[PDB]
Design an enzyme around this catalytic site. Structure first.
Site, PDB file in Angstrom:
ATOM      1  N   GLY A   1      41.270  -7.889  29.841  1.00  0.00           N
ATOM      2  CA  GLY A   1      41.385  -9.089  28.918  1.00  0.00           C
ATOM      3  C   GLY A   1      41.987  -8.617  27.690  1.00  0.00           C
TER       4      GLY A   1
ATOM      5  N   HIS B   1      62.258 -13.675  17.259  1.00  0.00           N
ATOM      6  CA  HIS B   1      62.801 -14.305  15.999  1.00  0.00           C
ATOM      7  C   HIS B   1      63.565 -13.209  15.207  1.00  0.00           C
ATOM      8  CE1 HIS B   1      60.333 -18.102  15.838  1.00  0.00           C
ATOM      9  NE2 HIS B   1      59.522 -17.179  16.578  1.00  0.00           N
TER      10      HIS B   1
ATOM     11  N   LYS C   1      50.266   2.914  27.254  1.00  0.00           N
ATOM     12  CA  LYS C   1      51.058   4.277  27.687  1.00  0.00           C
ATOM     13  C   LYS C   1      50.461   4.725  29.191  1.00  0.00           C
ATOM     14  CE  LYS C   1      53.797   5.135  23.943  1.00  0.00           C
ATOM     15  NZ  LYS C   1      54.987   4.557  23.916  1.00  0.00           N
TER      16      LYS C   1
HETATM   17  C1  LIG Z   1      41.594  -0.721  33.605  1.00  0.00           C
HETATM   18  C2  LIG Z   1      40.444  -0.050  33.312  1.00  0.00           C
HETATM   19  C3  LIG Z   1      39.594  -0.191  34.665  1.00  0.00           C
HETATM   20  C4  LIG Z   1      40.743   1.323  33.096  1.00  0.00           C
HETATM   21  O1  LIG Z   1      39.479   1.940  33.083  1.00  0.00           O
HETATM   22  P1  LIG Z   1      39.338   3.664  34.033  1.00  0.00           P
HETATM   23  O2  LIG Z   1      39.752   3.012  35.204  1.00  0.00           O
HETATM   24  O3  LIG Z   1      37.777   3.973  33.878  1.00  0.00           O
HETATM   25  O4  LIG Z   1      40.300   4.493  33.294  1.00  0.00           O
HETATM   26  P2  LIG Z   1      40.012   6.045  32.878  1.00  0.00           P
HETATM   27  O5  LIG Z   1      39.223   6.828  33.519  1.00  0.00           O
HETATM   28  O6  LIG Z   1      41.462   6.456  32.892  1.00  0.00           O
HETATM   29  O7  LIG Z   1      39.732   6.011  31.266  1.00  0.00           O
HETATM   30  C5  LIG Z   1      38.726   7.163  30.448  1.00  0.00           C
HETATM   31  C6  LIG Z   1      39.623   7.377  29.133  1.00  0.00           C
HETATM   32  O8  LIG Z   1      40.433   6.274  28.932  1.00  0.00           O
HETATM   33  C7  LIG Z   1      40.256   5.592  27.663  1.00  0.00           C
HETATM   34  N1  LIG Z   1      40.266   4.189  27.659  1.00  0.00           N
HETATM   35  C8  LIG Z   1      40.120   3.379  29.170  1.00  0.00           C
HETATM   36  N2  LIG Z   1      40.452   2.091  28.994  1.00  0.00           N
HETATM   37  C9  LIG Z   1      41.144   1.980  27.983  1.00  0.00           C
HETATM   38  C10 LIG Z   1      41.558   0.743  27.057  1.00  0.00           C
HETATM   39  N3  LIG Z   1      41.618  -0.522  27.722  1.00  0.00           N
HETATM   40  N4  LIG Z   1      41.959   1.183  26.060  1.00  0.00           N
HETATM   41  C11 LIG Z   1      42.201   2.184  25.380  1.00  0.00           C
HETATM   42  N5  LIG Z   1      41.700   3.407  26.037  1.00  0.00           N
HETATM   43  C12 LIG Z   1      41.300   3.308  27.220  1.00  0.00           C
HETATM   44  C13 LIG Z   1      38.828   5.923  27.206  1.00  0.00           C
HETATM   45  O9  LIG Z   1      38.506   5.511  25.900  1.00  0.00           O
HETATM   46  C14 LIG Z   1      38.516   7.218  27.884  1.00  0.00           C
HETATM   47  O10 LIG Z   1      38.731   8.247  26.889  1.00  0.00           O
HETATM   48  P3  LIG Z   1      38.102   9.838  27.125  1.00  0.00           P
HETATM   49  O11 LIG Z   1      39.507  10.805  27.724  1.00  0.00           O
HETATM   50  O12 LIG Z   1      37.812  10.156  25.857  1.00  0.00           O
HETATM   51  O13 LIG Z   1      37.140   9.657  28.229  1.00  0.00           O
HETATM   52  C15 LIG Z   1      39.708  -0.614  31.839  1.00  0.00           C
HETATM   53  O14 LIG Z   1      40.455  -0.020  31.106  1.00  0.00           O
HETATM   54  C16 LIG Z   1      39.571  -1.961  31.881  1.00  0.00           C
HETATM   55  O15 LIG Z   1      40.914  -2.634  31.547  1.00  0.00           O
HETATM   56  N6  LIG Z   1      38.484  -2.546  32.088  1.00  0.00           N
HETATM   57  C17 LIG Z   1      37.986  -3.770  31.216  1.00  0.00           C
HETATM   58  C18 LIG Z   1      38.377  -4.849  32.517  1.00  0.00           C
HETATM   59  C19 LIG Z   1      38.270  -6.160  32.106  1.00  0.00           C
HETATM   60  O16 LIG Z   1      38.941  -6.387  31.132  1.00  0.00           O
HETATM   61  N7  LIG Z   1      37.517  -7.075  32.561  1.00  0.00           N
HETATM   62  C20 LIG Z   1      38.335  -7.700  33.755  1.00  0.00           C
HETATM   63  C21 LIG Z   1      39.301  -8.743  33.617  1.00  0.00           C
HETATM   64  S1  LIG Z   1      40.904  -8.579  34.312  1.00  0.00           S
HETATM   65  C1  LIG Z   2      57.903  -7.750  15.488  1.00  0.00           C
HETATM   66  C2  LIG Z   2      58.428  -7.201  16.749  1.00  0.00           C
HETATM   67  C3  LIG Z   2      59.857  -7.959  17.126  1.00  0.00           C
HETATM   68  C4  LIG Z   2      58.971  -5.673  16.276  1.00  0.00           C
HETATM   69  O1  LIG Z   2      59.979  -5.116  17.569  1.00  0.00           O
HETATM   70  P1  LIG Z   2      61.305  -4.131  17.391  1.00  0.00           P
HETATM   71  O2  LIG Z   2      61.962  -4.780  16.230  1.00  0.00           O
HETATM   72  O3  LIG Z   2      61.847  -4.126  18.635  1.00  0.00           O
HETATM   73  O4  LIG Z   2      60.569  -2.735  17.353  1.00  0.00           O
HETATM   74  P2  LIG Z   2      61.039  -1.199  17.160  1.00  0.00           P
HETATM   75  O5  LIG Z   2      62.270  -1.094  17.955  1.00  0.00           O
HETATM   76  O6  LIG Z   2      61.438  -1.153  15.745  1.00  0.00           O
HETATM   77  O7  LIG Z   2      59.978  -0.282  17.190  1.00  0.00           O
HETATM   78  C5  LIG Z   2      60.018   0.414  18.354  1.00  0.00           C
HETATM   79  C6  LIG Z   2      58.711   1.412  18.634  1.00  0.00           C
HETATM   80  O8  LIG Z   2      57.596   0.752  18.084  1.00  0.00           O
HETATM   81  C7  LIG Z   2      56.628   0.476  18.831  1.00  0.00           C
HETATM   82  N1  LIG Z   2      56.122  -0.830  18.523  1.00  0.00           N
HETATM   83  C8  LIG Z   2      56.960  -2.131  18.658  1.00  0.00           C
HETATM   84  N2  LIG Z   2      56.189  -3.278  18.496  1.00  0.00           N
HETATM   85  C9  LIG Z   2      55.120  -2.827  18.505  1.00  0.00           C
HETATM   86  C10 LIG Z   2      53.917  -3.391  18.531  1.00  0.00           C
HETATM   87  N3  LIG Z   2      53.638  -4.802  18.293  1.00  0.00           N
HETATM   88  N4  LIG Z   2      52.687  -2.844  18.513  1.00  0.00           N
HETATM   89  C11 LIG Z   2      52.753  -1.380  18.403  1.00  0.00           C
HETATM   90  N5  LIG Z   2      53.728  -0.729  18.635  1.00  0.00           N
HETATM   91  C12 LIG Z   2      54.864  -1.488  18.618  1.00  0.00           C
HETATM   92  C13 LIG Z   2      57.141   0.714  20.170  1.00  0.00           C
HETATM   93  O9  LIG Z   2      55.951   0.985  21.323  1.00  0.00           O
HETATM   94  C14 LIG Z   2      58.210   1.420  20.198  1.00  0.00           C
HETATM   95  O10 LIG Z   2      57.918   2.820  20.251  1.00  0.00           O
HETATM   96  P3  LIG Z   2      59.185   3.997  20.599  1.00  0.00           P
HETATM   97  O11 LIG Z   2      59.428   4.670  19.661  1.00  0.00           O
HETATM   98  O12 LIG Z   2      58.497   4.896  21.740  1.00  0.00           O
HETATM   99  O13 LIG Z   2      60.573   3.283  21.177  1.00  0.00           O
HETATM  100  C15 LIG Z   2      57.302  -6.880  17.804  1.00  0.00           C
HETATM  101  O14 LIG Z   2      56.502  -5.796  17.783  1.00  0.00           O
HETATM  102  C16 LIG Z   2      56.813  -8.322  18.295  1.00  0.00           C
HETATM  103  O15 LIG Z   2      55.826  -8.817  17.714  1.00  0.00           O
HETATM  104  N6  LIG Z   2      57.192  -8.776  19.329  1.00  0.00           N
HETATM  105  C17 LIG Z   2      56.404  -9.961  19.986  1.00  0.00           C
HETATM  106  C18 LIG Z   2      56.753 -11.145  19.514  1.00  0.00           C
HETATM  107  C19 LIG Z   2      55.461 -12.185  19.664  1.00  0.00           C
HETATM  108  O16 LIG Z   2      54.496 -11.975  19.595  1.00  0.00           O
HETATM  109  N7  LIG Z   2      56.022 -13.383  19.829  1.00  0.00           N
HETATM  110  C20 LIG Z   2      56.333 -14.496  19.201  1.00  0.00           C
HETATM  111  C21 LIG Z   2      55.104 -14.979  18.450  1.00  0.00           C
HETATM  112  S1  LIG Z   2      55.142 -15.097  16.755  1.00  0.00           S
HETATM  113 CL   LIG Z   3      66.877  -9.308  14.260  1.00  0.00          CL
HETATM  114 CL   LIG Z   4      54.712 -18.184  17.905  1.00  0.00          CL
END
Ligand SMILES: CC(C)(COP(=O)(O)OP(=O)(O)OC[C@H]1O[C@@H](n2cnc3c(N)ncnc32)[C@H](O)[C@@H]1OP(=O)(O)O)[C@@H](O)C(=O)NCCC(=O)NCCS
Ligand SMILES: CC(C)(COP(=O)(O)OP(=O)(O)OC[C@H]1O[C@@H](n2cnc3c(N)ncnc32)[C@H](O)[C@@H]1OP(=O)(O)O)[C@@H](O)C(=O)NCCC(=O)NCCS
Ligand SMILES: [Cl-]
Ligand SMILES: [Cl-]
Ligand SMILES: CC(C)(COP(=O)(O)OP(=O)(O)OC[C@H]1O[C@@H](n2cnc3c(N)ncnc32)[C@H](O)[C@@H]1OP(=O)(O)O)[C@@H](O)C(=O)NCCC(=O)NCCS
Ligand SMILES: [Cl-]
Ligand SMILES: [Cl-]
Ligand SMILES: [Cl-]
Ligand SMILES: [Cl-]
Lengths: 189, 189, 189
Positions: C141, C114, C179
């Site tokens: 998830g 928007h 990231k």
């Molecule tokens: C994708 C996934 C397997 C990655 O986990 P992993 O393979 O063990 O990855 P890593 O070994 O790189 O992660 C270890 C580190 O990353 C961080 N990390 C891992 N998953 C993270 C997540 N989803 N969000 C934020 N941080 C995350 C941990 O906090 C940890 O930090 P540390 O340096 O303090 O130890 C896992 O994040 C995931 O999504 N599991 C949930 C599965 C799920 O959603 N169910 C199935 C439906 S599709």
């Molecule tokens: C609100 C919104 C439009 C703002 O995006 P934007 O105006 O393009 O944002 P900016 O360019 O000012 O911000 C850029 C930075 O903020 C971060 N950022 C932007 N949106 C973010 C979010 N939702 N969560 C976390 N970080 C976010 C990016 O990672 C980016 O990092 P960079 O410095 O490395 O480039 C966006 O966050 C959003 O919500 N989009 C999804 C819309 C949605 O949910 N659909 C409609 C349903 S209501």
């Molecule tokens: Cl705008």
């Molecule tokens: Cl919406």
């Protein structure tokens, strides 16, 4: 070992083609469907369905619809477990929940891992990491708990947290990734 | 004071055993259930149910199903409020929403707090922190707004944000925890 | 240009008052409603509804209910696409999904933007940013993917991620904001 036995032993298992596990998931999905389409004030029907789903006689386990689980029988529940709307207990790995547990809306307890390598993942294999949820816990809304994680008794998980690592007992923890902020004094008032 | 009066005064209250509050929640859940099982093109029926739920005559309040609330009558609505799928207005504390508000899918507006000490929490007591959502706001999907938080008029909350603190007006804010990124120019084009 | 043509060309468009677009959203919402109220074991009926919704003959596209989309015909699907419960493909901008894609529960793929200025936003205008999801990907998830984002083939997105920027192929990426953590070795085993 059967695929079920592998699933329960933390081994890779054929989640997508094992007929037994397919059928068990279908069973749980159809019960969840019925539950999700039963009026909330139809107390006895809901209790019957919940008990059928979890294959146990629950004691004050309150499930607010919609709810989802994969097997149902692999969720072990204490008493006084309050589950708000839109939760998912993804229970190929056992999900153990203690007594007096408050689970906010939109929480996902995820035990499934897939291989990172797409060749192996594409074959449907999974490995399940059990989740243990201590007694006397509280989860805010929008929390995800990842495979293999334990949340200690007496702890509180802030809304929106992504719990990637175990949380010690009697701790307040928040964030993505979820980190302990401080201890909780849980002594008798 | 009654437990409802305590709820509305930001005091601890008996959320789990007060019959009045139990009954009000049951009323709202059954209406939500009916709404959630009403065809989206059944315009008049949906408007009737929404107006019954909120105990008001809404003016262009569009609710995409599923929707959930606790009380209904404790959500105060402006005109032109657009609520996408799977939102939850957890309204023990009043949720006030202004005019011209765009709420994305899977947003949770959470007013409930529980005691941190499990002995007090297990007794079911809660304390509700009102949420105020300014006019002329936009929330992306997957946002959680926590108890007591105010979002200023003219502000935009990025998808996935966890809004733990008040957001000033005319601001773009994102993140977990949600932080202001910059100001928005909302001058008349 | 019609408003549909503007929507598909990444231009501002009249999302709220264009009758064609309103009608197309109504079509998709009524099909979703039917799907969401069809027993999960009613395989043929579900397939028929999915194929009507996406206007294609799907090849092993598994949709766990509930599911939501805006248009349906604007989601382009490969084969072997596994969508767990409570996903939303918000597809005013095209959502292209490759082959062999695992999408976790409570994922939102959001193409809508928007205006930031409330005067323009209140008029209902939107701008759609397509999402591209590579083949051979896995999403945990509770993931949100934002407008215009591409996830490269062979990549894995951790649970809870908010994918604000493009993810290179063969990468593991997590977080809010999401990231890259490291590369994935996808060599043929
Ligand atoms: C994708 C996934 C397997 C990655 O986990 P992993 O393979 O063990 O990855 P890593 O070994 O790189 O992660 C270890 C580190 O990353 C961080 N990390 C891992 N998953 C993270 C997540 N989803 N969000 C934020 N941080 C995350 C941990 O906090 C940890 O930090 P540390 O340096 O303090 O130890 C896992 O994040 C995931 O999504 N599991 C949930 C599965 C799920 O959603 N169910 C199935 C439906 S599709
Ligand atoms: C609100 C919104 C439009 C703002 O995006 P934007 O105006 O393009 O944002 P900016 O360019 O000012 O911000 C850029 C930075 O903020 C971060 N950022 C932007 N949106 C973010 C979010 N939702 N969560 C976390 N970080 C976010 C990016 O990672 C980016 O990092 P960079 O410095 O490395 O480039 C966006 O966050 C959003 O919500 N989009 C999804 C819309 C949605 O949910 N659909 C409609 C349903 S209501
Ligand atoms: Cl705008
Ligand atoms: Cl919406
Ligand atoms: C568990 C909870 C009560 C903790 O909040 P609290 O007791 O007030 O926490 P604290 O005072 O220790 O934390 C304050 C700081 O942590 C941050 N914080 C608090 N809760 C956070 C959360 N859920 N995610 C990220 N950061 C959080 C704040 O941004 C603040 O930072 P500051 O130093 O800039 O002020 C709260 O996070 C929560 O979950 N509330 C939502 C309730 C809910 O989901 N409804 C009920 C359903 S179960
Ligand atoms: Cl709750
Ligand atoms: Cl692996
Ligand atoms: Cl407290
Ligand atoms: Cl999944």
């Amino acid at each position: 070992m059967t695929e079920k036995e592998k699933m329960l032993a933390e081994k890779w298992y054929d989640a997508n083609f094992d007929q037994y596990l397919i059928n068990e998931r279908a069973r749980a999905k159809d019960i969840c469907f019925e539950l999700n389409h039963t009026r909330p004030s139809a107390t006895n029907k809901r209790k019957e369905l919940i008990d059928q789903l979890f294959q146990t006689t629950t004691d004050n386990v309150s499930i607010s619809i919609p709810f989802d689980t994969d097997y149902g029988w692999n969720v072990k529940l204490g008493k006084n477990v309050y589950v708000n709307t839109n939760c998912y207990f993804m229970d190929g790995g056992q999900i153990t929940i203690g007594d007096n547990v408050f689970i906010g809306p939109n929480c996902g307890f995820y035990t499934a891992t897939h291989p990172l390598n797409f060749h192996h993942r594409n074959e449907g294999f999974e490995k399940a990491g059990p989740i243990h949820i201590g007694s006397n816990t509280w989860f805010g809304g929008h929390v995800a708990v990842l495979p293999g994680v334990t949340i200690g008794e007496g702890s509180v998980i802030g809304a929106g947290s992504v719990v990637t690592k175990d949380i010690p007992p009697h701790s307040l923890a928040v964030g993505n990734p979820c980190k302990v902020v401080r201890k909780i004094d849980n002594d008798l008032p």
